[PDB]
Design an enzyme around this catalytic site. Structure first.
Site, mmCIF file in Angstrom:
data_model
loop_
_atom_site.group_PDB
_atom_site.id
_atom_site.type_symbol
_atom_site.label_atom_id
_atom_site.label_comp_id
_atom_site.label_asym_id
_atom_site.label_seq_id
_atom_site.Cartn_x
_atom_site.Cartn_y
_atom_site.Cartn_z
ATOM 1 N N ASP A 97 0.782 -1.236 0.000
ATOM 2 C CA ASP A 97 0.000 0.000 0.000
ATOM 3 C C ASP A 97 0.815 1.288 0.000
ATOM 4 O O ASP A 97 0.372 2.315 0.526
ATOM 5 C CB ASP A 97 -1.001 -0.009 1.167
ATOM 6 C CG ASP A 97 -0.333 -0.252 2.515
ATOM 7 O OD1 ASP A 97 0.867 0.087 2.670
ATOM 8 O OD2 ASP A 97 -1.028 -0.769 3.427
ATOM 9 N N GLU A 119 -0.518 -9.016 -0.911
ATOM 10 C CA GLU A 119 -1.145 -8.355 0.247
ATOM 11 C C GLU A 119 -2.313 -7.474 -0.195
ATOM 12 O O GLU A 119 -2.246 -6.243 -0.164
ATOM 13 C CB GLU A 119 -0.143 -7.569 1.105
ATOM 14 C CG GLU A 119 -0.698 -7.178 2.474
ATOM 15 C CD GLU A 119 0.292 -6.348 3.258
ATOM 16 O OE1 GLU A 119 1.129 -6.942 3.985
ATOM 17 O OE2 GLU A 119 0.242 -5.102 3.132
ATOM 18 N N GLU A 133 -2.151 5.499 2.550
ATOM 19 C CA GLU A 133 -2.080 4.056 2.303
ATOM 20 C C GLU A 133 -3.434 3.392 2.008
ATOM 21 O O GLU A 133 -3.500 2.476 1.186
ATOM 22 C CB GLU A 133 -1.373 3.333 3.452
ATOM 23 C CG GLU A 133 0.134 3.603 3.556
ATOM 24 C CD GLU A 133 0.497 4.844 4.362
ATOM 25 O OE1 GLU A 133 -0.417 5.632 4.735
ATOM 26 O OE2 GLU A 133 1.712 5.021 4.635
ATOM 27 N N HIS A 215 5.966 6.077 12.591
ATOM 28 C CA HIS A 215 6.126 6.881 11.374
ATOM 29 C C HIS A 215 4.845 7.127 10.563
ATOM 30 O O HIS A 215 4.938 7.633 9.448
ATOM 31 C CB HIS A 215 7.207 6.274 10.455
ATOM 32 C CG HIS A 215 6.791 4.995 9.799
ATOM 33 N ND1 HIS A 215 6.884 3.770 10.429
ATOM 34 C CD2 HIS A 215 6.274 4.750 8.570
ATOM 35 C CE1 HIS A 215 6.434 2.828 9.619
ATOM 36 N NE2 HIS A 215 6.060 3.395 8.483
ATOM 37 N N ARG A 217 2.042 8.747 8.609
ATOM 38 C CA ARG A 217 2.008 10.097 8.051
ATOM 39 C C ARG A 217 0.908 10.966 8.675
ATOM 40 O O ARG A 217 1.135 12.150 8.949
ATOM 41 C CB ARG A 217 1.847 10.008 6.524
ATOM 42 C CG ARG A 217 2.043 11.303 5.748
ATOM 43 C CD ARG A 217 2.015 10.990 4.249
ATOM 44 N NE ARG A 217 3.073 10.050 3.879
ATOM 45 C CZ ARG A 217 4.161 10.366 3.177
ATOM 46 N NH1 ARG A 217 4.337 11.604 2.704
ATOM 47 N NH2 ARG A 217 5.071 9.428 2.920
ATOM 48 N N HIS A 248 13.066 6.223 12.252
ATOM 49 C CA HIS A 248 12.762 6.159 10.829
ATOM 50 C C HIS A 248 13.486 7.340 10.189
ATOM 51 O O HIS A 248 13.684 8.352 10.844
ATOM 52 C CB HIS A 248 11.248 6.281 10.647
ATOM 53 C CG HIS A 248 10.774 5.962 9.265
ATOM 54 N ND1 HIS A 248 10.978 6.807 8.193
ATOM 55 C CD2 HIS A 248 10.064 4.912 8.788
ATOM 56 C CE1 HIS A 248 10.433 6.278 7.112
ATOM 57 N NE2 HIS A 248 9.879 5.126 7.445
HETATM 58 C C1 LIG Z 1 3.097 7.148 1.041
HETATM 59 C C2 LIG Z 1 4.049 5.945 1.211
HETATM 60 O O1 LIG Z 1 4.358 5.194 0.339
HETATM 61 N N1 LIG Z 1 4.580 5.800 2.555
HETATM 62 C C3 LIG Z 1 5.444 4.645 2.879
HETATM 63 C C4 LIG Z 1 6.811 5.167 3.236
HETATM 64 O O2 LIG Z 1 6.671 6.151 4.195
HETATM 65 P P1 LIG Z 1 7.929 7.225 4.433
HETATM 66 O O3 LIG Z 1 7.621 7.988 5.665
HETATM 67 O O4 LIG Z 1 9.257 6.525 4.406
HETATM 68 O O5 LIG Z 1 7.826 8.279 3.195
HETATM 69 P P2 LIG Z 1 8.751 8.331 1.838
HETATM 70 O O6 LIG Z 1 8.978 6.964 1.248
HETATM 71 O O7 LIG Z 1 8.085 9.325 0.913
HETATM 72 O O8 LIG Z 1 10.246 8.895 2.356
HETATM 73 C C5 LIG Z 1 10.293 10.236 2.874
HETATM 74 C C6 LIG Z 1 11.590 10.717 3.167
HETATM 75 O O9 LIG Z 1 12.267 9.837 4.226
HETATM 76 C C7 LIG Z 1 13.558 9.912 4.024
HETATM 77 N N2 LIG Z 1 14.116 8.584 3.772
HETATM 78 C C8 LIG Z 1 13.250 7.448 3.630
HETATM 79 C C9 LIG Z 1 13.818 6.124 3.369
HETATM 80 C C10 LIG Z 1 15.286 5.958 3.251
HETATM 81 O O10 LIG Z 1 15.778 4.871 3.017
HETATM 82 N N3 LIG Z 1 16.142 7.099 3.400
HETATM 83 C C11 LIG Z 1 15.576 8.440 3.665
HETATM 84 O O11 LIG Z 1 16.305 9.408 3.782
HETATM 85 C C12 LIG Z 1 13.767 10.789 2.685
HETATM 86 O O12 LIG Z 1 14.027 12.149 3.165
HETATM 87 C C13 LIG Z 1 12.617 10.619 2.039
HETATM 88 O O13 LIG Z 1 12.346 11.700 1.040
HETATM 89 O O14 LIG Z 1 7.600 4.039 3.799
HETATM 90 C C14 LIG Z 1 6.988 3.435 4.995
HETATM 91 C C15 LIG Z 1 7.836 2.289 5.417
HETATM 92 O O15 LIG Z 1 8.973 2.717 6.189
HETATM 93 C C16 LIG Z 1 5.589 2.918 4.679
HETATM 94 O O16 LIG Z 1 4.993 2.469 5.907
HETATM 95 C C17 LIG Z 1 4.747 3.986 4.040
HETATM 96 O O17 LIG Z 1 3.497 3.413 3.602
HETATM 97 O O1 LIG Z 2 14.138 -0.676 12.414
HETATM 98 C C1 LIG Z 2 13.389 -1.413 11.857
HETATM 99 C C2 LIG Z 2 11.920 -1.204 11.919
HETATM 100 C C3 LIG Z 2 11.034 -2.155 11.193
HETATM 101 N N1 LIG Z 2 11.609 -3.273 10.478
HETATM 102 C C4 LIG Z 2 10.753 -4.157 9.703
HETATM 103 O O2 LIG Z 2 10.209 -3.380 8.784
HETATM 104 C C5 LIG Z 2 8.771 -3.979 8.473
HETATM 105 C C6 LIG Z 2 7.768 -2.891 8.663
HETATM 106 O O3 LIG Z 2 8.156 -1.768 7.874
HETATM 107 P P1 LIG Z 2 7.694 -0.269 8.379
HETATM 108 O O4 LIG Z 2 7.342 -0.296 9.843
HETATM 109 O O5 LIG Z 2 8.763 0.702 8.002
HETATM 110 O O6 LIG Z 2 6.380 0.176 7.484
HETATM 111 P P2 LIG Z 2 4.835 -0.411 7.451
HETATM 112 O O7 LIG Z 2 4.802 -1.898 7.724
HETATM 113 O O8 LIG Z 2 4.073 0.385 8.486
HETATM 114 O O9 LIG Z 2 4.422 -0.056 6.039
HETATM 115 C C7 LIG Z 2 8.612 -5.019 9.355
HETATM 116 O O10 LIG Z 2 8.974 -6.279 8.642
HETATM 117 C C8 LIG Z 2 9.556 -4.759 10.509
HETATM 118 O O11 LIG Z 2 9.990 -5.862 11.216
HETATM 119 C C9 LIG Z 2 13.054 -3.468 10.398
HETATM 120 O O12 LIG Z 2 13.508 -4.367 9.794
HETATM 121 N N2 LIG Z 2 13.919 -2.527 11.103
#
Ligand SMILES: CC(=O)N[C@H]1[C@@H](OP(=O)(O)OP(=O)(O)OC[C@H]2O[C@@H](n3ccc(=O)[nH]c3=O)[C@H](O)[C@@H]2O)O[C@H](CO)[C@@H](O)[C@@H]1O
Ligand SMILES: O=c1ccn([C@@H]2O[C@H](COP(=O)(O)OP(=O)(O)O)[C@@H](O)[C@H]2O)c(=O)[nH]1
Ligand code: NA
Length: 379
Positions: A97, A119, A133, A215, A217, A248
């Protein structure tokens, strides 16, 4: 390898959940299985790719600091076409999602490329929670040609939305496959388990540990601030407990977490952890405080009480079984529920019960069958 299958994903949770399916499909000699990552995430994606030894065939290289939803959506739509054109896949598999899921699905739908949704069918019933999501998975499900539902309830959601019965396969959730794979890595290798444990020399074997992530949103700003204050209150009440919080990388939570929680002796803010280490931490935990989707599935499977810092969820089973409780971001409620788990060993035993409605850890094989047949704390 006549059948061409393209798996596409962009973020940490998708990569973990897709890894066993990637492995299963790549192993076959009668499938041409290819991987495209959108790189919506970079470090948090790479941690998964390296652990599971997945080298993507395509990388759209999209992540930028502080990106917007529109940035990710347009980035994918622009760049994915060249991938589709190069491979000409028979089916595109997307996960879950995220905005990656949405944008890849739209791109494929626009080209009459059949989509399989790994999923499928999770619903909160609220287009604003989780945001975006809920929208992402609804759109993906509307345009998909196969729906791999993790539960009967998710299947029922799809059917109620008019999805044909033949399109829905209730496969369970591949997260169990991944969790089992990593649990085995730890259990079968003592040297590995020792090395993983040694990454956290600040941990005291005599202290109860609480594991934290956050984390969502829709919680940015005031709800997250309240969550942090609840953690401070708990840390002060339980100076003998250790609160471990892998941050995060989203700046909207990383920066306030550091600013608000950085001065507490028993709150350990650490980098996001690779999945092997994170499973170790979940297994070590007394309980978990989280708004993660995947942890809501994994925690209860490991028999760990989970306090879910959301006002709603799309994973009702653990709530119904009692192993998870919704606490939202009300500080008084978070503190009350966490305190009960520290203070009452009988409450703890009543709540710490394995719950797994997601299948036996062979969801990947069922999907394939349907298709074919030291860490230093931050201060
Ligand atoms: C709208 C969407 O798809 N959100 C997903 C995204 O949220 P998440 O909060 O990570 O949102 P984004 O994927 O848009 O990343 C936002 C910002 O986080 C920072 N960033 C993120 C990842 C990384 O490896 N390095 C880094 O620097 C960047 O500044 C980046 O631009 O990932 C989460 C998993 O963790 C998921 O639960 C969310 O569903
Ligand atoms: O520091 C971390 C935090 C989460 N996870 C794993 O990341 C998945 C969940 O991803 P996240 O919480 O980022 O996003 P969501 O599931 O809410 O989309 C799960 O398998 C967690 O066990 C990980 O490996 N390291
Ligand atoms: Na192969």
């Amino acid at each position: 390898h006549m059948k061409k299958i393209l798996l596409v994903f962009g973020t940490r949770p998708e990569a973990i959940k897709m890894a066993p399916l990637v492995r299963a499909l790549k192993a076959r000699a009668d499938v041409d299985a290819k991987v495209c990552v959108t790189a919506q995430h970079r470090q948090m994606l790479d941690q998964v790719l390296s652990l599971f030894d997945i080298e993507p065939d395509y990388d759209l290289d999209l992540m930028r600091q502080g990106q917007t939803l529109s940035d990710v959506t347009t980035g994918i739509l622009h760049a994915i076409g060249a991938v589709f054109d190069d491979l000409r896949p028979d089916i595109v598999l997307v996960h879950g999602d995220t905005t990656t899921t949405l944008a890849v699905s739209l791109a494929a739908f626009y080209r009459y490329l059949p989509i399989g949704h790994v999923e499928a069918g999770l619903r909160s019933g609220d287009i604003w929670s989780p945001w975006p999501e809920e929208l992402n998975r609804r759109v993906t499900d509307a345009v998909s040609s196969w729906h791999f539902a993790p539960t009967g309830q998710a299947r029922d959601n799809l059917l109620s939305e008019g999805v044909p019965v033949g399109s829905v396969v209730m496969t369970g959730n591949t997260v169990i496959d991944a969790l089992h794979d990593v649990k085995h890595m730890l259990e079968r290798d003592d040297a590995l388990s020792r090395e993983v444990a040694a990454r956290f020399p600040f941990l005291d074997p005599t202290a109860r540990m609480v594991l934290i992530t956050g984390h969502r949103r829709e919680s940015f700003g005031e709800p997250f601030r309240n969550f942090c204050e609840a953690l401070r209150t708990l840390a002060h009440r339980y100076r003998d407990a250790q609160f471990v919080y892998p941050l995060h990388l989203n700046p909207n939570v990383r920066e306030p977490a550091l600013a608000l929680l950085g001065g507490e002796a028993n709150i350990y803010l650490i980098e996001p952890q690779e999945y092997l280490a994170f499973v170790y931490l979940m297994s070590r935990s007394h309980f978990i405080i989280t708004d993660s989707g995947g942890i809501q599935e994994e925690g209860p499977a490991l028999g760990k009480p989970v306090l879910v810092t959301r006002d709603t969820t799309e994973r009702p089973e653990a709530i119904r079984a009692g192993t998870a409780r919704l606490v939202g971001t009300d500080p008084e409620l978070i503190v009350r529920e966490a305190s009960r788990l520290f203070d009452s060993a009988s409450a703890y035993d009543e709540m710490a019960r394995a719950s797994n409605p997601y299948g036996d850890g062979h969801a990947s094989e069922r999907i394939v069958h349907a298709l074919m047949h030291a860490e230093l704390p931050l201060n």
